[PDB]
Design a protein around this nucleic acid. Sequence first.
DNA 1: TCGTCTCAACCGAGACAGCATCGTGTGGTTCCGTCAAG
DNA 2: CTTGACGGAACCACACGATGCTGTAGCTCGGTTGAGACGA
Lengths: 67, 1339, 96, 278, 97, 49
Amino acid sequence: ARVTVEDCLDNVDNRFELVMLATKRARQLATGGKEPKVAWENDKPTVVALREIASGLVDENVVQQED
Amino acid sequence: EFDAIRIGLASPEMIRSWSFGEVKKPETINYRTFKPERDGLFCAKIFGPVKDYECLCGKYKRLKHRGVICEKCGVEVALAKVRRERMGHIELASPVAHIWFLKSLPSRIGLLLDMTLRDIERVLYFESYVVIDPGMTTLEKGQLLNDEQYFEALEEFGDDFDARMGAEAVHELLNAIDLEHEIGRLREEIPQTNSETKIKKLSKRLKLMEAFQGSGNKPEWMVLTVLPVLPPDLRPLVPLDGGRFATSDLNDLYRRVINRNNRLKRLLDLAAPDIIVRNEKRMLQEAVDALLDNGRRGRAITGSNKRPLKSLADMIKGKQGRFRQNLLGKRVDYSGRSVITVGPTLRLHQCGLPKKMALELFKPFIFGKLEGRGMATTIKAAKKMVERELPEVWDVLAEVIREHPVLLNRAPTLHRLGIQAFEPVLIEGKAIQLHPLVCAAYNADFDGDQMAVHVPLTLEAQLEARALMMSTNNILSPANGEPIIVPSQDVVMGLYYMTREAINAKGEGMAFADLQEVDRAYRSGQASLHARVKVRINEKIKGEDGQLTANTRIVDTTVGRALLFQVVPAGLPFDVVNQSMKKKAISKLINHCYRVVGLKDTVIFADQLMYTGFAYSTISGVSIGVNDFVIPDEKARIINAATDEVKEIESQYASGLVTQGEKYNKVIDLWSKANDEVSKAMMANLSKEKVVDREGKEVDQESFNSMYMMADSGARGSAAQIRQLAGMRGLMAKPDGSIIETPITANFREGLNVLQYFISTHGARKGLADTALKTANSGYLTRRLVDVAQDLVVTEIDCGTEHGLLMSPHIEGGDVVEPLGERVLGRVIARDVFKPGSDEVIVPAGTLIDEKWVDFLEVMSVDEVVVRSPITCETRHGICAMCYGRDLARGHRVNIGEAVGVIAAQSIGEPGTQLTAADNVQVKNGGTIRLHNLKHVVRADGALVAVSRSGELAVADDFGRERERYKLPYGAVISVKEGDKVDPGAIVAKWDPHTHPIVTEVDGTVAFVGMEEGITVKRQTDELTGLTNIEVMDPKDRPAAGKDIRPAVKLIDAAGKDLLLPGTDVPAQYFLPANALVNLTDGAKVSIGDVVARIPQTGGLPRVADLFEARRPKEPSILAEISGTISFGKETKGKRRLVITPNDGSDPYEELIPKWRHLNVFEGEQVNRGEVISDGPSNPHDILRLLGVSSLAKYIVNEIQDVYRLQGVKINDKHIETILRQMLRKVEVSESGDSSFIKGDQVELTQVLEENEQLGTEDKFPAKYERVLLGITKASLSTESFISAASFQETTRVLTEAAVTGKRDFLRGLKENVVVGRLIPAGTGLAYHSERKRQRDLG
Amino acid sequence: RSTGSYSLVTQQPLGGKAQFGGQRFGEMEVWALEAYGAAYTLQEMLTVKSDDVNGRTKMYKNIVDGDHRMEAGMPESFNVLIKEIRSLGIDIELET
Amino acid sequence: TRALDATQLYLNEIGFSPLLTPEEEVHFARLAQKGDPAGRKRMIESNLRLVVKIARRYVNRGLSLLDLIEEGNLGLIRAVEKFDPERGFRFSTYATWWIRQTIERAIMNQTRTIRLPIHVVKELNVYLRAARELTHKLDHEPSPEEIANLLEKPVAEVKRMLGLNERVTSVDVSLGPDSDKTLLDTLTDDRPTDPCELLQDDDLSESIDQWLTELTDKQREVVIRRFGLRGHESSTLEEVGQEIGLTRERVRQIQVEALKRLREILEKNGLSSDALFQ
Amino acid sequence: NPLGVPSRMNVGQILETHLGLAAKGLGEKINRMLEEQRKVAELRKFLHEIYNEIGGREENLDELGDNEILALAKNLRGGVPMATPVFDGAKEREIKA
Amino acid sequence: RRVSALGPGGLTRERAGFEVRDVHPTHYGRVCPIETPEGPNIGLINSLA
DNA sequence: TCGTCTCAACCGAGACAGCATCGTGTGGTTCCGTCAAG
DNA sequence: CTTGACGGAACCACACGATGCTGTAGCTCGGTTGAGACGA
Ligand SMILES: [Mg+2]
Ligand SMILES: [Zn+2]
Ligand SMILES: [Zn+2]
C-alpha cells in the first residue's frame, strides 16, 4: 500500500537499473499503450511503476518487448 | 546533439566568419526616439531586432518570414532570441596582442621567447625596441634595444633589418617563430643541462612546444586583428522610470574602444609620425586591457562615482572572486523560501504543506489535470479560479498531493542530507510542517531560518528522487555506521522513564498475562510504569533464513520493558532492550535492526517508536527545577581550602622564593584538579539523589531527577556542562594565550558576581569567535576539497588485480583508542586472511564484511587485516566498485555509477564546524610483549639495549591481538624480555628524553684517538670535586687547527689485538661529539652496552588544512635517504651533509640539512628509511620519497583519526583514502626516451603507454616513473579540462593554457557536464553514454 | 513562484515581474544532488527548469498531451558559453 | 626595479620636445604648405607642452587622460594639416581652439551611453552652467521652475531637456559598501520572456484553433482570412472580395455574427470579461 | 522543552518561570481580594507582607488609601513587576518565600 | 550605542582574523561582549556599556 | 673555478557660429472598415 | 438581398529644426622570480 523500494533493493542489490525500468514503465503507462498489472489504489503512475518494479513482474527484456 | 568539446586557437578569418558585421559608430540609442540606428552597438543589421518578428525601419511586422532581408535596411527579420546568437566585430588596422597571456601568473610569451615579462611589456609600452628576422646581425630576434640602440643598429646595417614595436612585431615573430621546428633545439639542449631554475623554464617551454605541436593551430593566431563585440542583449538598455536607462559598464568600454579605433582609422591616413602612432597604439593597448580585465594597471574610473568599471572578466565571472556567473548565482524556477515547523502527527513517508504554496508548486500538474478532466480547457480561467480561491480547487488538487514527491533544501547547505523527499498533505496556514526525526539529519534546529522548496517537473525526476533522497533510503550516514536519523531528547526520555528498576512502587511482584494485557493493566491507573513484575513474551527469532520460530522466555523485565517490546516487532530479541536506553545505546539498536532487516521494516518501526516515545514523553512528568541542582556542602569547604592555599601561594610569591611561571603552572593544574574533583563529586551527588525504601529503612538506587536522566542519556550535552550549572564552572583561559588564576567560587544556582562573569565572558567571546569563523573556514576548505574529488566515477565492476593496504587500529597511548571493528565495518577483503595456526583460511574470496563478520573477527584474534583499497587500483580514469566498501546509504555493496568522491569529501566537510614527556613507558593492561622491526642486543647485566629507533613496542593480549602500541626511540632500555608473562602497570621500556646514552657492541679496553686537551677535549673540574671527567669542546668554540679533527674512541682487546664488530670491516670505534662527558677513562675494560657518554637533549582547522594541502610546515622533519649506515660529512662548512653509506647499494648523492634544525642523528648508527630524526611533522609528499604508499597512508589515517576522535564524530578511512588516491593520481618521470626528463602526467596514461610500448617494434621504449603526491590547490590544475578548471582558478591563466594547449578533450568529468546541463556520466547516464559510444565511431 | 521571467545573460528566472525569485542553486546544492549515484535529475533540473529555448515548450507539451519521449535537444547555456569563448577567437568544432 | 606604467613612459618620451623661437615654427609652416614630411613631423613632435597643459585642465571626467592627450594631438595635427600661413600669427591659439573643439567632441561622444548631437549638448551645457550660476545664490537644490523662469523657456520644455540627462551608474556598484548582490539579477526585461506568457500564447493559439475547427467552415474561413491567423496574410474583405465574398456588408455581417457566436460559446465555456482581463 | 537548561547553559529559565508563578499567584490573590470586597487595611497589610522580604527595601506607609492605593490596585491587577540587578540579584530563598 | 570596526579607515569582516575578535580585561565597564549581532560578524562590532 | 640547489621577497585569492542635407511630425488625399437605410 | 456616409490607417510631399561636418590664430596562504652557496 506504501511506496517500498526495499523489496527491489534486497532483490537486485543494484539501485541503478530499476530507475530506468520504472522510467520506461511510467512512460508506457502515461502513453496509454500498456495497461498496469497491479490495480490503482488512488495513486499516480509513479507508485504503480515502483510497485511493479518491487513486485518483480516487469524486467528489462519484458519492458524491451513491451516497447 | 554535440560532441568534441575542445579548445583551439583560431585565425582572424574564422573570427570574421563567426562575426556578422563591422561596427564603426558609437550609436547605442537615438536621442530623438527610442529606436537604435545602424552600424552601432545596438544595431539591427549585425545582431537583429529588438522585438519579436519586426524590422528596424518598421516595414515588415508579420510572422511568416524568418530568413528574409529587407530592402531599406540590411537586417534579417527573426525572433527576439536572435540577439543572443549573432555578434559583431571590430577591425584592427594594427593587430593588438592579448594581455591575458601576459598579466597572469605565467607569461607564456616570455616562455616561448625565452624572455621575462618586463621586456615583453616594455616593447608594448613603447620604451624599448625589438627586431624581427635578424639573420646576419650582432643582436638576434630575442635581444632588446632602446631608441638610440635601434637607431645605431639601423645605421650600422642599412639593409636586412626590420625594427618594429608594439604587437605587430609580436605577430611577426609568432608568424616566423617555427614552433614545429624550434622544439628540436630545446629537446637537444634539455639533456645538456640538469639545473632546477633553468630546467623548469625548459620544461614549461617543451610543454608549450608539445602543446603547439599537438594543437594543430598556428602560433600567429594569438595576436588578433579582428576583435568581436559583446552581444547587445547580454548588456542591458531598457527604459527606466522617468525616461532613464540602465546600462552596464561593458557598453561603455566597448564604445570607448570603438571610438579609439575610429580615431586610429582617422589618424592612419594623414602620413602620421612615429611618436603619435606609438601613443595611439599604446592607448589602444590599455583600452583593450581595460576591455578584458580591471584592477591591474589601467584603474579606469567612471563619471560621478568611485567604483571602477566592469570588464568582460566581470561578465564571464561577475562577483565573488574568480567564479563564473553561472557558478556564483543560479535562481532555479519552481522554488520559494519558507519557514519550517515540526509536525508530530505525520509518518516518515509523508509530511505537511500549506495550501497557499500548494496551489502554485503543483501548477503545471493542476493545469494538466484541469485540461484533461474536462472542467476548464483554458489556462487564464484556470489562473482566475486558482487566484479566486474556489471551493473545487482543493478537490481537484488533492489528487497530486497524496502520491507526489516534493524536495526541500536548507538555504545554508551543510551536507548531503539537507535535501530530502517527502509527501505533502492538505493543511491550513502559511508555513510548512516537517518530520521530527529528520531535523537531526538536517543539522537544523527549529530556529526560524529560511528553507526553500523544490518541485521537479517530470514524473521521472519524482521517481528517481523517491529512489535517491527519499527518507526510507538515506538512513545510514555517510560518515560512519551510525544512522543519520538520530533520536532526540523526548523519545529517549520516554524510553528512560519508561524502563526503570524501581525499589518501591504500587504493584511490586505482580504477574502479567501478556504484552497487551500489561498495556491494559498499566493504563488502568493502579499499576506503575517502573515495578519489579513478571511477564511472558511471545518472541520470534529471525536467526534462520526464511523461518521465524516462536518461543517463550521467562525474564525479569519491568512494566516499561514489556511496553517497550510491545512496540518493538518480532525481528528483535527481548534481551537487547534490557539496558538503560542511552542515546548511543538506542543508536546502536536502530543501526543493528536496520542492518538485520533492511529498510522498510526499519522505517515502519521508526514511526511507531517515535509515536510511543511521544506519548510516553507526554504522559511523563519530569522537569528541571531548583531542587534538581543539588549543591554539596563540601564544595564551599573545597573553595575555602583552595582560597587559603592560593593565599599561601601569593604570600610565598611576594616573599621572594619562586618566580611567576612556577606558581602559574601550580595554579593552572591545581585549579583543574579541584575542578574535576568537584565534577566527580557532582556525579556522586547526582547519582545518589534518591531516598526510597520498600519494607525497609533505606535503599539506594539511581536518582529520579531530570538532570541525572539527561546526564546518563546524553542526548544533547555532556557531563562537563553541569559543572557550570551546579559545581565549579571551570577555568576559562584568556584569549591572549594565558589562563586566569582566580576560580569561579559561585555557580549558576547561587549566583555569580561581576568578576567571575568577566572571566567567563572572555571564553564565551572566544567560543563565539571560533563558531563564527569555523563555518567560513570549513566552507573555504570544502570548496576545494570536493572540487578536487569530482572525478571519482565508477565504470568498472571487477578488474582482477591483487593489491591492498593494511589497516591497523589506533592503539596509541595506554589502551586502544579506535577498535578494529569500528574501522573495517562495511569494507571488503582484499586477499585471504592468515590464521595464527597452519594452513587455516577463513574465506578465499573478497566477500563483504556484514554484521556477522565483525563479531566473527572479534571472536578471532586477528589484527593485521588487509582491505581492498582503491589507492592501488588498475582501472583507468575512475575507480572500480569492487574496491569501494559498503559505506553508503544502502546496506548492500556499492554498484556502477556512484560518485564516491563527493560523499568522501562531504564526510570531512560536515563536522568541520564543530571543531575548535616520554620519560617512562608504562603499560595499562596485562599483555605479552611483541617485538616488531627492532634490532637489539642483550647486555651482560641482563638488560636489553635497542640501537634501532624504528622499533615499536606492541603489547599483544592473551589471545594474540595487539591492544597497545608504543614508540621506542634509540638507546632505550628494555627491562622485560620477549616471550614472558604479562604484568599490568609494570615498566617495560625506559628512555631518557633528557640524556642520550651511547651503548656499545664489543668489549675490551678503549683508546681515544684524535683527542687534544685544548682543541677537542678540555679538563673541566667542578666545585668541591663535583665532576672529574673529560669535557669535549664545541665545534664553534674549538681552535682553527682542531676544527676539522674528530675524536674516535677506538675499542680493542686487553692483550693488544684489534677488535672489530661483526658484519662490517671497520672496527667498532665510537666518535666523541660536542657537549659530551666520558664516564670511564681510556685504557680500562668496558663491557658491551655500557653508557660511554651523556648527551643532553597546532590542531583543528589549520592542521587539517596543512595535511590536506600536502605542504611543508614551518619546521619539517628531515629523514635519512637510504636504509643503512648513517654517517656525518661536512660539519663547519655551512650546512650538515649527512651522508648515507649502505651495505647493498651506495649512492654518491647526500641530502642536505640546515643548521637551524636540530639533528638527532647518531654518528655511525644504522638509521633506516622509516626512522624520523628531526622534531616536528613530516608532510605526506615529503614522506612519499623513501618508503612508499602504505606507511604514508597509515600515517595519514592516523593523523586524521586522532584529531577527529577527540571531537566525538567518527569517520571511516575510505573517505580520505579515495581523495588520497585522487591527489596521488598524477606522478612524474625521471627518464627520457619516450617523454622528457621532468614532466607531470597521470599514472594511467603512463601505464597504457608502457602497455603499448612493451608490445611493438622495440623491446622497452618506456621507462620507470616516480610517485609524487599533490595537495588540493595543484592536483586539480593538472587536468585535461578547461571549463572545469575555469571555475575555481583564474580564467586568465587556464583559458590561455587551453588556447595554447589544443587538447581535444572529451566529456569526461562532472563539472564539464553540470556547466552546460547535458547527460551526466556518473549515475543513470551509463545507458546513454554506452549508446553514444556505440553510435559514435562504432558499428 | 511557479514560472518566472528569465534573465538577459542566460535563461534563468529572476524577480521584477511582480513575483519573487527562487533560491540559489549554487555549487553545494548540485554537489549534494550528485552525492548519490544519479544522473537524470541533474540534467532535468538544468535543461528543463532553466537554460533552454524549445525544451521547456516540448516538455510542457508532453506534460499536457500525456505521452513522454524525453528528447535531449540543445540547451542555451552551451550557446552562451560558445559565444563568450568565440569572443576571444577560439576554434571549437564538433567531430561526430 | 622600474615602473611598469604608461603615463610615466609617455612623460619621459615627451621630454625631447624642443621649444625654439617662433621663426622656426614659421619656417615649418612654410615648408608644410608646399608638402614635405618633416615640418609636419616637427610640429607634431615639438608642440606637446600646450597639449598636456590643455589636457590637465579637463581632469576628473568620464574619460582617461590618454584620451585627452590623444584628442589634443589629434586637434593639433588637424590644425597644422589645413594650416594657412597667410595670417602670420601664432598657431598655438589655433591648436588651442582645435583642441577645445576636439575635447568638446570627446565630452559629447565619450561620456554618456546615449549619443547626442552638438546642439542638444550645447543647450544642456548652457543650462547646467545657468543652474550652477543660480544655485550659488539660491543655496538649495536646483529645480526646473527657476531655470525656466531665468532662461525664458517653458517648464515642460526644459523638463524634457533635463530628462535626456540620464547619468547611468554601474550594474555592480550596489547600495552600500558590502556588495553581496549586484543589480544584474534585480531587474528583468520589459518584453514577455516568461514561460507563463509564451505558454498562455500557445495555449490560446491551440484553443482558438480548436474553436475555429469546431465552428462552421465559412465562419472559420472569414475569421482566419481577415485577421491572418491560420496561415493567411494581412488581407481583408477589400482584398478577399474575389476570394470569399463579393459584398462587403454581407461578409461584415457574417464576421460580426461569427464574433457573437464565439462570444456566446466563450460565455458557455466559462470565459467572461472579468475572468480574462481581471 | 527541558533541554534549554542543560544544553544551553542558562538556568534562568527555571528561576524566571518560578518567579512568574509566584507573581501570578500574588496577582490572582489580589484579584480575588478585590473581588471579595475587603477593606483598605487588609490591602495595606497585604502590601506590607509582600514588601518586607529579605532583599530590597520597603516604600510603604506613604501612599494615600483613597487615590493611590486604588490606582496601584487597578494598575497592578494584571501582574506585578520585579526589579533585579544583573550580578547581585535575587537569591533563591526569597523566591522560596 | 553600536561600536562597529567596519567602514572607512577600519577593519572589515575579512580583515578581522583572530586579533580584533578577542577581548582584554581592560574592558571592565567599557565594552560589553554580550551585545553583538549574530551571523558573519561577531567580535568586531561591539556595544557601549 | 662554475652549474645547480635552496632561499626570501612579489603577487594574487576567499565656445561660437555657419554650412549641406535629413527624418520623422503634420497634414494630404486616398483606401479601408464600419454604420444606418430600405 | 441592394444603396450611400464618417472615423481610422497608409504611404507620401512639405517641412522645421536637426543630424553631420567645418573654420577662428593668447586577513592566511599558495605559485613566481632574483639571489647566495656548495661540490666536481
Ligand atoms: Mg536555526
Ligand atoms: Zn524592414
Ligand atoms: Zn582496483
